[PDB]
Every structure is written in C-alpha cells, then in structure tokens.
Amino acid sequence: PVARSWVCRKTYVTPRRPFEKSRLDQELKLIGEYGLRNKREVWRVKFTLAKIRKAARELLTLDEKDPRRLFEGNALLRRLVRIGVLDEGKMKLDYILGLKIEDFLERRLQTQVFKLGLAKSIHHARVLIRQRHIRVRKQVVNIPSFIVRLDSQKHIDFSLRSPYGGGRPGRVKRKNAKKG
Amino acid sequence: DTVTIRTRKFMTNRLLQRKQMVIDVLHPGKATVPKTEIREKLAKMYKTTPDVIFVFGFRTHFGGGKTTGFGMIYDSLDYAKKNEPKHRLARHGLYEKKKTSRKQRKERKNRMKKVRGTAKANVG
Amino acid sequence: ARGPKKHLKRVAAPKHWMLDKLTGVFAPRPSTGPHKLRECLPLIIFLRNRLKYALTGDEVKKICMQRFIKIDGKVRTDITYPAGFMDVISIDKTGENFRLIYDTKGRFAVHRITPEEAKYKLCKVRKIFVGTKGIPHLVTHDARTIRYPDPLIKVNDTIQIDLETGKITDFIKFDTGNLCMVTGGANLGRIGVITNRERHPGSFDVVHVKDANGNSFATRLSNIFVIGKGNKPWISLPRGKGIRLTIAEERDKRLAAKQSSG
RNA sequence: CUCUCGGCCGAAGCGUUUACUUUGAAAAAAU
RNA sequence: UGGUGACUCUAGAUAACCUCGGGCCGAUCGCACGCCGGCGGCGACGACCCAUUCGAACGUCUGCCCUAUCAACUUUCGAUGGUAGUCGCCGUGCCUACCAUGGUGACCACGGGUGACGGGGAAUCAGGGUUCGAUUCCGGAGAGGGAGCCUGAGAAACGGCUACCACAUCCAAGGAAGGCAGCAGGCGCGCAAAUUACCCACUCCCGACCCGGGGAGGUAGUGACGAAAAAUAACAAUACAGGACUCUUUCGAGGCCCUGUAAUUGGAAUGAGUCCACUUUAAAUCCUUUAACGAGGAUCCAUUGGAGGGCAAGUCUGGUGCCAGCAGCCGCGGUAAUUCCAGCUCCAAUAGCGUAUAU
RNA sequence: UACCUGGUUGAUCCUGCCAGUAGCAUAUGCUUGUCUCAAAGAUUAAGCCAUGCAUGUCUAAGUACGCACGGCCGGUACAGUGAAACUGCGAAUGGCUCAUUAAAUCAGUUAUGGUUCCUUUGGUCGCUCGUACUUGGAUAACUGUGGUAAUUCU
C-alpha cells in the first residue's frame, strides 16, 4: 500500500472504421482550419462532445420536473455558457444536442490568438503560445488546448517578459547587435 | 527594489508562541529570492529580529510572477528552539546532526545485541 | 487477526473526518474511550485538520503535552483521544471553548461557546440498572455511570450534567414535542421536533421528526438524541440551525451571497 | 375498518394472508 | 426496588460454603509545601468487580462457476433427534453413556472439476448482456508440509518453542544452528517483472515516553505497463507555376487573395542541450524561477506498417521468372509482376507503430 | 455512432462459417526529443535462498554503592548526568502471498435474554466487628575463578 492515486481517463476514442474518405477528409479540414497537430486532437474534442451530448440525452429522458434534471441540467447549461459555446437566449437543454465540433474549437487558445489578430496565422498562433508569449491576465499559458472562458477573453495580451510586450529581445536580436 | 512581500493567512498561536502565516512574493524579474533575503523583508514588516523568523516551503508558479511559501514568527528564540522541527534549526546553524548513517548504527545495534551486560559498551 | 488491530488506513477512515487520499497511508486510529471510532473525532484531526493550530502530527504533540487542551474540563494529553458528540473541548491559553455538535451535512463543526455554557453538557442515557443494595445507576453515551439519579429519569432521556461535579442538574424526557438532533444514519445532523414514535417489538423503533420548516422525516430510535424541552434548546446551536437544504436552494444561496459580496 | 381509556381524535384490537407497486430507514470508503 | 416484546433479569431475604495450584479489602513512587505537641494539597503507579471502548467468537435469513460418462447419499468409526452429564469462555453430538430411526435428494442431494480466496470493483457495451477481479480498501487463510504447545487480555504465533517429514548450514565428528509467500539482492523457472540506495522530515504505530525505534511508510534509482499535456518549425520579400475578384471583344493588365518548388534571399522567436545561483528537500535530485552560452537546413536530419480487393494510397522503373517469396481471406509469382526483392513516389497513424495470445 | 465488408457460382438469391474491423490486456519487435502521474517476479516454482536490514522502549514518578563522568561541601542515608541489569510493557499490529477452501469463505441482514474482553473513559475501593513511625528471604547488574572448535551457550 502506498499514498498514490491511480485514477486517470483516456481523452479520445479511435473510430470504428479506419479508412473512409468521407471521414478522413472531414477531420483533415478541421485540422487545417484550426492548426491541430494530429488526428488525436480531433478525436479529443469529438470525445468530449460525445459525453456532453450523452449526459444531456439521459436528462431528456427524465421527467421535466424531476429535481435531478432541474439541478444537474442547469449546471451543464451553465458550464457551456461560460466557455462561450451556447448563448444566453439559447440556454435550454434541448439545444445542447444542437452543438458541433467546431463550436468548441472556436474557443481553443490557439484559435483565439489568431481571431484577435495577435498572430498573423492560425499556425503562427500555436507557435506563440508554445513560445510563451501569451498570458491570460497574469499567467503565461503554455498550452494551445486551453478553453478560454467568456469573461477570460477580452483581455489576453503579450506576456510582459516577452519581446513583443515588454521588449527585452531574445537571442537573435542580441547577437546581431554584437557585431555592429 | 521591485520585490514585495504580502502575507495572506495570518494567525497567532498562543499555544506554540508564534505568528503563523503564508507568504506572497512578487519577484517579477529575478529568480526565486533566497530565504535570507525574505527574512530581512519580513522581520522589518513585523518589527522582530530576523534571528527568530523561520520560513520554508516556497514554490514559484509557472512564469515567475509569484512565489508562495510558509512562515512563522516566534516570540522568543528559546521557544523557537523548542517548537521547531530540528532540520529548520540546522538551516540556521542552530542544530547539529551526528554524521552516522542508518546503516552505521543498525549494524552496531545488532552487534551489541549479541553481548552480555558489560561489554555492550565496547562494541563500536 | 490474532488480536486487536492498532492501525487505520486513510481509505478506511470515516468520511466525516474529511481526510484526503494523498497525504499518507494511515489515519490516526482513535484510542479506546468514551466513544466509538466510527463516531468520534480524535483530538489531532480537530486540532490541526480543523482548527489549523498545528501543521504536522508532531506539533499536536507539542500542544497536548503542554496541557492546554481540556476536554470536558479535564486535561487530556492523548492525541488519538476519541472526542464525540456533545463534548466540551476547552483551551484556556487561547480562552476558547468548543463543543462537537454535528453540522447539517453530518460532520463535527467548529462551534464556539460562551464560557458560561462551557460548564455543562448533555447526555443521553443508554441503560438504567439497580446494582448492589438498591442503588440506581445511569449510563450515559459517554459511559458516565451516575449513581442515585432521579427516579423519573428513564431510558432515552437527556440530562444536563455539570462538568465540575459530574452530577445531574435537570433533564428532558423522551416525549413527542421535544427538540432533537439525529445522531446516525441518513438524516445525521438534522434538527427537528418529534412528531411520533412508532414501536416495533423485537426490532428497531422508528421516530418521526419534523423540522422547523415542515420537512418531516424519520430515523431509528437509537440514532436520536434529545436537545431541549419543546422548541427551546438548552444549548447553543451552530449557524446552520440544523435544517437540511436541498442542493438547488443550497446553490441558490451561494449565488446571491456572491452577488452581495462585491 | 371496530369497542374502550386519555388530550371528536390519539392510543388498543386486528382488516383472510402474501406477491406486486410506491414510500421511509438502513446500507464503509476508494471506484 | 427497577427493567424488558419477553428471564430462570436486576435488586432483596434466609440457611450455609468459600479451594493453601488461595479473591478483593494498597507495607509503592514523585512534586509543592503550608496549616492547629498533632494534620493536610496535587499527581503517578495500582486493583476484585461493574459498565464503556476496541473488538473477537459462535449463530439467523437470502445469495456462488462447470459437471449426470456423479442418482442416491449419511449411519458398524455420530449420521438426525431426545435425556443426563463431561468439556468449553459461552450455545450445541462439541464429546461420552442410554434410547429413538432419523437427515438430505431432479426445487439437482452426493461425488468430481475449477487456468476458483470472496466482495467493493474492471473491461466491453444502444437496450439486454458477456468476460475478468493473483493486485494497494474489507473479510478470510498460511508462513517448506503436517502436528503439538509455553507466555499473555488476546497466538494453536512461526522475524516464539517442541518434535516428525523434506530440504539444507558449521565442525576438531563430540556436537551446534535453521525457514525471505518482510525490504533489498541472488539462483532456478519461464513469453513475462526493478536498487544489497537515502530517511524517520511527512502519515501513522509502538514503548515507562514532548526526547527512543519502525525496509510500516516516505525519497530517489530502474521504468515506451498504462494514462495526461505536448517540439521536430514560423513569418516576410522576390523567381516563376499559378488559379479565384476586378478592367479588358479577346489579348493582356492588375496592389486583391491564396497555394506550392525555390540546397533563393531576409533577420525575427525559440526550446532540446551545456550550465552559475535561488528554490526543492531530512540532505539532495526532478519540475518551477532566473544569469551566460546554445538554429539554416545532407543540422538539433521521425519511424512503424502499407500501396490488387476488403482497405486510404502507383496500372512508375529495375531485377527474379512456380524459383525466391508475398498474402489474416480471396489470391499473386511460369519474361510488361499494380501483390515478391530494390529505387522513386504517396497514405495511415504519429513519439509512436507493427506482431503473437486471452477476452 | 443501435454499422458492416471480402470469400463456394458460368452467373443469381440463401443458409452459413472463415477472414477482415474496433477495444482491452500480457508478452514482444522496431523507434524515441520534452514534461506530469504511474503498474511492476501474480500467472510458472506457496520453488531454493548467500549477505545486510525489517522490534523495540524511560519519565520527575518502580529498582543506581559502575567515579563512567564531573560536581557541591565536604562527615549531611540518597545532590546531578547516567551505561548496564532486574522489573513493567510491546513483540498477536504492520508487511507479504493467494496455495488450500464450492453453502466453506464472503456480502447484505440480524441476534448474544448464550460468551470473553489488556488498554482507555466512568463508577467502586475506612459498607467486612476479627512491627505498623514499615516485615521476610533471594537473585541480577558489579568483582573474581572458569569450560567448549563452535552461537544472543552458560
């Protein structure tokens, strides 16, 4: 016996059919639209939405005045409004099933650097975040797979230790100045 | 210069004769500040001497904005020599550990276990 | 096992202690005493895990050996000492007084007392017998056997014991209409007036209890404990008054308090 | 559903009994 | 008297007994010392009994995989019950004596097998289900196999003893000493599994105990079991090829976009790494934090499988020519082989990806 | 995500298996830069085990005539620190393993009005009508003499 915790999920599910052009083409468009690394990063969001929809399936089977549906459903409807997926006018549990994969990947940090005009490419943004140039209010975030909350969006900036924000230059601009 | 200390969870044990608290550090440019520099910052915040304030358990976040640690301020050094774990007295030179390893004496313990009453002191 | 077990795993701990998984293997194994280990806080969990007066399991040693902790007015030094329900924990250097009243959710709370109220307690009787030349004897839940009680005092009644002398002062009898707190099972920690006691010979008796907002429920008999005479409690009462909230109104209570706390 | 005691109701007799259904308590923590 | 749903309960009374291998009824220590020649306050060890706590132990009801090529089983040596006892801590064929002739069984007894320790649980799933659970929590069991004990409150204890059986150690030959299914580590076995490391600082336990000890446990090492995050490039200007929006009968033009080939240019940003110091910690290491150094393509160079179909992706080139081989299946291979052996290309997953096997 | 696809024929529609497909575990082959957790001699051999360690313990408060120290002040029975040894306690928890075991174990559920219980918490402890201003003998530790090749032997 030790003092360790052995719990861990798996965060993706490999699909049933390995090779079909309708699926390989439809995953690879989303990789190219959103700068993802491999197919696992598509198979991850698709797996989290496979759980959000499956939990909302069993709530729709219950009685409409069942208190378990009223409490647990109003939490799930709350947790999607805060990450900017559903909306205030559409906060009913029927609409959770009307969600798509790229509804979620609009809220990855890799895409929200690009949509805000900080990066000049969707690929240039995955650079910057891993290059530690991006901060969320005070915190250098080093992961593109970072679901920006709806209040956590309107201030995302250039990480004051960076050459872009606070302006101490890196290795390259120092060595070029060591010649002239 | 631009290093700043605040204390979040302040508490006064009368039953350990100390002032138990949690330390915020703002070191935005530098490395993690050493223990002795934070004691000089702290002992003049709370008007004691740095002789008696003991800090430990510091941890810097991802990005170097802050470091959070623990700190306790005794009322007298005689109490601090009583109510402190004895590795944090060695960190101020107030304690010395003997230099025998565990395999040293546990060999010796089983050797002297074989001897009757007189010569158990002879085995070393 | 060939004898009594002296160890307790943190996984096998009772949940109301609120130990966590990751800070070690073993739990602090309450000593034999006036309470059951499924029922008690040891002093160490109360002292460092609740009050945060100590950090490790050795700074608790450096408080108990310095004799600052009185439990029902008696200086106790054991750290694995089972302090149970309706039990006055007092510390004189700080000048603080604590009683282990179960909170709403079934856990021992940090309940501060007037030092006047710190001089007594309440105790449910457990059995009443006559031993050795006609001397009547009580047994409380603390195993305080008190000889020569009032003859009116019967089993399942609650007595106010002065802690100094160790002698009874007055009592409430188990009757429909008195105030009670559940001390076991699903409804643990909840507080309400007794409505009814249905009886079952050869088996367990169910008491139907009704809260201060009409929320009626039931227990067994042996999990109930009388508090007061009717609606008035003879002791002080924690800030959650003993009324269990449903989760939606518990959530809704937080969501307005976070708005007012701006 | 019934005749008495106690403050018309409560307590008491049982209504031929069970299954079923619904409720309530009891059901270790970890998962 | 007092209690139970219910006593042959508790309490009372009387007569007696009370084991010498005996039952309590104190010949014990520490500290503050102060009061009417004389008294006392805190404690610490005690202790018959009673309750309490920790339990333990015997029971109650219901629930277990496969098997009929196991259909009757138990009773002469207790099988089912009765009475009296012995023994037990207590209830009882637990055991003895004497009686009775029972007890279980297709509603599957009994016997046999299990690659069976049982649960909490795990994998897989539409719903139903199927399969696993040696393994950190709970209960059980055993310390080579049996058996028998001493001590104690608690043991049929094995880091206690005594034997036997089987192994095996030292020796002067007389004797003596064992038990890793504890942590390490070794041999053997195998398809299949790690360091003779450091520490009691945490978590807790034990002891006369704030102070000692703990291979419990923690900390490092080995670690592609498995799980989480996540680099191997980004941008700009030209060389064109493009190709969309615009003007233009077309031609052509565009400053409006996008894509590629650039061993083309261009400085910008970096971690991997080397390494002060701080932090970490029992002391370290790792991570985090920060100096200094550290990026232009044969380097800081991504590999595993495949390209007939199923099944995504060549009718390319060269060799071999029922050979060598491929191929889970169908099939390919006998001079243009889309299937072998190689080169080029491209496609699937990607720090992973093939194969065998159980499911 | 409530799913199929190839294969008997000259060709078709079936029965149907075989093979493909996804997971999950164990082994394995090749490859491997970073970082966070983390399984790990179960399967077969409940086979055999070099060496080391894993169980000990003192408060003010059971017993101190070891100068083993220093130390009053020296006639104060005994100042102190205190090894050893007697005593008391613990060693029956923990750790490991899964061989035996098929109404056995175990789980839920009940009982002890049918038992035992160190410890802790509480009660009780001039309730017995019959040298005490303190009893007796001994053994360790210590000193000394020894045995055996051999040990925690004596």
GROMACS .gro file of C-alpha atoms (C1' of nucleotides) in nm, chain B residues 98 100-110 112, chain E residues 199-200 213-214:
model
   17
  278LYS     CA    1   2.557   1.340   1.412
  280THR     CA    2   2.638   0.843   1.130
  281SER     CA    3   2.416   0.691   0.864
  282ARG     CA    4   2.134   0.450   0.943
  283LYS     CA    5   2.338   0.153   0.826
  284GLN     CA    6   2.610   0.256   1.073
  285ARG     CA    7   2.416   0.219   1.398
  286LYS     CA    8   2.180  -0.053   1.282
  287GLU     CA    9   2.484  -0.268   1.222
  288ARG     CA   10   2.606  -0.169   1.566
  289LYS     CA   11   2.269  -0.235   1.733
  290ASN     CA   12   2.269  -0.593   1.613
  292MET     CA   13   2.580  -0.516   2.064
  796C      C1'   14   1.547   0.897   0.564
  797C      C1'   15   1.228   0.870   1.012
  810G      C1'   16   1.256   0.292   1.747
  811G      C1'   17   0.988   0.147   1.288
   0.00000   0.00000   0.00000
